[PDB]
Design a protein around this motif. Sequence first.
Motif, mmCIF file in Angstrom:
data_model
loop_
_atom_site.group_PDB
_atom_site.id
_atom_site.type_symbol
_atom_site.label_atom_id
_atom_site.label_comp_id
_atom_site.label_asym_id
_atom_site.label_seq_id
_atom_site.Cartn_x
_atom_site.Cartn_y
_atom_site.Cartn_z
ATOM 1 N N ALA A 1 -8.117 33.638 0.177
ATOM 2 C CA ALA A 1 -7.091 33.183 -0.734
ATOM 3 C C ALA A 1 -6.209 32.148 -0.018
ATOM 4 O O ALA A 1 -5.331 32.507 0.783
ATOM 5 C CB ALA A 1 -6.256 34.351 -1.236
ATOM 6 N N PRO A 2 -6.472 30.855 -0.249
ATOM 7 C CA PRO A 2 -5.756 29.761 0.399
ATOM 8 C C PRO A 2 -4.394 29.461 -0.222
ATOM 9 O O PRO A 2 -4.066 29.952 -1.318
ATOM 10 C CB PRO A 2 -6.683 28.553 0.196
ATOM 11 C CG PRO A 2 -7.885 29.056 -0.521
ATOM 12 C CD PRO A 2 -7.493 30.346 -1.149
ATOM 13 N N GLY A 3 -3.612 28.662 0.490
ATOM 14 C CA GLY A 3 -2.326 28.232 -0.002
ATOM 15 C C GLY A 3 -2.453 26.951 -0.823
ATOM 16 O O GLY A 3 -3.548 26.626 -1.288
ATOM 17 N N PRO A 4 -1.362 26.206 -1.035
ATOM 18 C CA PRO A 4 -1.386 24.970 -1.817
ATOM 19 C C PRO A 4 -1.740 23.707 -1.005
ATOM 20 O O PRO A 4 -1.899 22.634 -1.577
ATOM 21 C CB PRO A 4 0.063 24.866 -2.354
ATOM 22 C CG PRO A 4 0.795 26.058 -1.792
ATOM 23 C CD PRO A 4 -0.003 26.523 -0.611
ATOM 24 N N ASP A 5 -1.872 23.826 0.308
ATOM 25 C CA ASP A 5 -2.120 22.629 1.153
ATOM 26 C C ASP A 5 -3.523 22.657 1.717
ATOM 27 O O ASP A 5 -3.855 21.884 2.613
ATOM 28 C CB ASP A 5 -1.146 22.581 2.336
ATOM 29 C CG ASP A 5 0.291 22.725 1.936
ATOM 30 O OD1 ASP A 5 0.890 21.746 1.472
ATOM 31 O OD2 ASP A 5 0.836 23.844 2.074
ATOM 32 N N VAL B 1 -4.758 33.656 3.548
ATOM 33 C CA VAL B 1 -4.989 35.096 3.699
ATOM 34 C C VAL B 1 -6.399 35.485 3.241
ATOM 35 O O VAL B 1 -6.840 35.078 2.159
ATOM 36 C CB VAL B 1 -3.927 35.983 2.955
ATOM 37 C CG1 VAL B 1 -2.546 35.775 3.523
ATOM 38 C CG2 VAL B 1 -3.920 35.719 1.460
ATOM 39 N N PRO B 2 -7.148 36.221 4.075
ATOM 40 C CA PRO B 2 -8.482 36.706 3.715
ATOM 41 C C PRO B 2 -8.447 37.569 2.442
ATOM 42 O O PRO B 2 -7.635 38.497 2.324
ATOM 43 C CB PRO B 2 -8.927 37.545 4.928
ATOM 44 C CG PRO B 2 -7.706 37.727 5.776
ATOM 45 C CD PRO B 2 -6.763 36.615 5.439
ATOM 46 N N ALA B 3 -9.329 37.270 1.515
ATOM 47 C CA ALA B 3 -9.380 37.940 0.227
ATOM 48 C C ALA B 3 -10.535 38.945 0.227
ATOM 49 O O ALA B 3 -11.066 39.258 1.311
ATOM 50 C CB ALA B 3 -9.547 36.902 -0.859
ATOM 51 N N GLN B 4 -10.939 39.459 -0.947
ATOM 52 C CA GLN B 4 -11.998 40.498 -0.977
ATOM 53 C C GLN B 4 -12.589 40.735 -2.378
ATOM 54 O O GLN B 4 -13.524 41.511 -2.525
ATOM 55 C CB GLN B 4 -11.456 41.839 -0.359
ATOM 56 C CG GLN B 4 -10.307 42.543 -1.146
ATOM 57 C CD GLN B 4 -10.765 43.311 -2.400
ATOM 58 O OE1 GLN B 4 -11.868 43.842 -2.449
ATOM 59 N NE2 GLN B 4 -9.934 43.355 -3.422
ATOM 60 N N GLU B 5 -12.075 40.057 -3.379
ATOM 61 C CA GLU B 5 -12.477 40.314 -4.751
ATOM 62 C C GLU B 5 -13.854 39.744 -5.084
ATOM 63 O O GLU B 5 -14.341 38.812 -4.436
ATOM 64 C CB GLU B 5 -11.422 39.837 -5.799
ATOM 65 C CG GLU B 5 -11.065 38.339 -5.773
ATOM 66 C CD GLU B 5 -10.193 37.934 -4.599
ATOM 67 O OE1 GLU B 5 -10.688 37.883 -3.474
ATOM 68 O OE2 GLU B 5 -9.008 37.655 -4.811
ATOM 69 N N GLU B 6 -14.447 40.285 -6.135
ATOM 70 C CA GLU B 6 -15.790 39.913 -6.623
ATOM 71 C C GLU B 6 -15.810 38.529 -7.331
ATOM 72 O O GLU B 6 -16.606 38.310 -8.247
ATOM 73 C CB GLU B 6 -16.276 40.991 -7.589
ATOM 74 C CG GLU B 6 -16.451 42.356 -6.953
ATOM 75 C CD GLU B 6 -17.535 42.387 -5.900
ATOM 76 O OE1 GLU B 6 -18.714 42.539 -6.257
ATOM 77 O OE2 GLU B 6 -17.228 42.300 -4.714
ATOM 78 N N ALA B 7 -14.970 37.615 -6.852
ATOM 79 C CA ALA B 7 -14.848 36.234 -7.360
ATOM 80 C C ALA B 7 -14.322 36.160 -8.785
ATOM 81 O O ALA B 7 -15.028 36.476 -9.741
ATOM 82 C CB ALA B 7 -16.146 35.436 -7.210
#
Length: 224
Positions: free
Chosen positions: A13-17, A184-190
């Motif tokens: 999950a990336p930020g805006p930049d 931040v590292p994410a984990q959801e099924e997209a």
Amino acid sequence: SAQGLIEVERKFAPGPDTEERLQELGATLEHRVTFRDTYYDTSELSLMLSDHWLRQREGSGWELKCPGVTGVSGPHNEYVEVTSEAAIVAQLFELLGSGEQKPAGVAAVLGSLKLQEVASFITTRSSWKLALSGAHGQEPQLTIDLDSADFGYAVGEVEAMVHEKAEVPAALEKIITVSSMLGVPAQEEAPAKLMVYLQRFRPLDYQRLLEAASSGEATGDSAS
């Protein structure tokens, strides 16, 4: 373990930049898609929850998601997307209960059956490719694909290919480290844009769907 090049992907999950950060870090912009995806539904979000997702992209054409089964009986046998208007025209008529004359195109059924645009946002897809390196010189090139939306949404999926499972932790940890630096590292099924529409505005409704739509790209060290 013989599956060839192991596509190791994890979600971030990336930020805006992100796009800028990537350019400066050295990731190349492979391809990017940008379009406004306009969702229509009845006033009750009956269409959305009926597994018939109606979307128009960039004012180009129409797209309808169907639960595979059109004569809905039983469970949803995968999703089948129809892009041909005549199919969507006839479908929308049967979906809303029209019984009327088929007009011509989807925009015509849209105004006639009076669907409301209940969700509209821009899909920003941005594919970056980052080459690993160091004292070893040539190290694998991994792809980072960003999926972002107008309503506060940004996801990156980072995928590297290793032919050796032993270098999976190596490549994968580089992936996570650069990512945690960037966001931040994410984990959801997209999440699809509409999955985001839901988690953003209707979280429990999102969960109903999420629990059922829990099939996303994130393996680890074994693709198969």
